[PDB]
User: Which sequence fits this backbone?
């Protein structure tokens, strides 16, 4: 599809821009939305930012977080959708795709290329890294606030420099941003040192349901909808739980099944050394990365999804072991 140079040209040609992120926004969504919005505003453009979803509490102290609106009153010339793989992921703003020329910028290999112009590069760990390069190509100069906001998505999507994607390019980008004043400690404190007591109790439920398979190489658990309700939690509160299960010594693949809301089952998969969970996810209707992937089902009992997913995982695991 289009490369960065074409996207930079299109952005340079329009001065009234609506930047839209996806529902259930994460660090890379917030980082990409705000870094692009503020970068474009430094070029003098009139820019609003929007997400059709509540912003998670861990973002509440971030500079300019209030710039992300739920109901922008705005007549944009250009819609720029960041970090969203498909039109359904941007909620009510998908209606604008029929009316406003659109740019898509994303790192997800599952992106449906739904914009008029699309720059999709799955070699980046974070869409925020693509925004960083676009801002530089446009001539934007960062201050510490913009550096912090752009650092956020690189940090969150690499697990704060822990996952397999924490490579030279990630460390180069992070060093550049920290040199420009990015507050790495602030970002870690707000994202990671903000636990609710209810989250400890919710993870205790996960451990109570934990099952090991294949001589300890596979671990899985689940959170049904009533269990979220019992602890005054949503699927916001189980973020990172599946990584805790992968962190068990000897576990190669961890899987967590999450029902929220009723009958919506999200399956999060993580692997350690060799098992390609993106292949298992894709075969089930989802996708992702070799070490972290997922799939989402609508209209199914958690009791039906769990054994079907575990069955396919076990068959793929046995096939993988046989060299
Ligand atoms: Cl990775
Ligand atoms: Cl995780």
Assistant:
């Amino acid at each position: 599809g289009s490369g960065m140079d074409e996207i930079v040209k299109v952005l340079s040609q329009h001065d009234r821009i609506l930047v839209v992120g996806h529902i259930m926004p994460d660090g890379d969504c917030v980082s990409s939305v705000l870094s692009l919005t503020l970068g474009l505003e430094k070029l003098g453009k009139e820019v609003k930012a929007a997400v059709d979803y509540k912003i998670p509490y861990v973002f509440e102290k971030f500079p300019y977080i209030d710039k992300i609106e739920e109901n922008p009153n705005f007549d944009p010339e250009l819609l720029v959708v960041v970090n969203a793989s498909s039109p359904d992921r941007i909620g009510k703003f998908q209606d604008l795709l029929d009316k406003v020329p659109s740019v898509v910028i994303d790192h997800h290999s599952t992106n449906t290329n739904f914009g008029n112009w699309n720059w999709v590069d799955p070699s980046f760990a974070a869409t925020a890294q693509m925004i960083f390069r676009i801002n530089k190509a446009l001539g934007v100069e960062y201050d510490s606030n913009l550096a912090t906001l752009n650092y956020l998505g690189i940090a969150t999507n690499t697990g704060f420099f822990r996952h397999s994607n924490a490579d030279v390019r990630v460390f180069e980008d992070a060093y550049k941003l920290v040199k420009m004043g990015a507050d790495a400690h602030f970002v870690a404190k707000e994202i990671l040192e903000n636990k609710r007591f209810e989250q400890f109790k919710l993870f205790a439920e996960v451990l109570e349901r934990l099952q090991l398979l294949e001589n300890g190489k596979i671990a899985y658990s689940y959170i049904d909808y009533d269990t979220y309700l019992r602890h005054n939690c949503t699927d916001e509160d189980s973020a990172g739980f599946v990584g805790e299960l992968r962190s068990i010594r000897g576990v190669e693949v961890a899987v967590l099944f999450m029902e929220f809301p009723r009958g919506k089952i999200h399956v999060s998969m993580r692997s350690k050394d060799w098992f390609n969970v993106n292949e298992v996810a894709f075969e089930l209707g989802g996708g992702g990365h070799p070490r972290a992937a997922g799939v989402t089902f609508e209209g199914k009992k958690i009791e039906e999804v769990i054994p079907r997913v575990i069955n396919h995982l076990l068959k793929k695991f046995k096939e993988g072991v046989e060299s």
About this structure: The two ends are 36 Å apart (CA to CA). The chain has two domains: 1-198, 199-323. The chain has eleven helices and twelve strands.
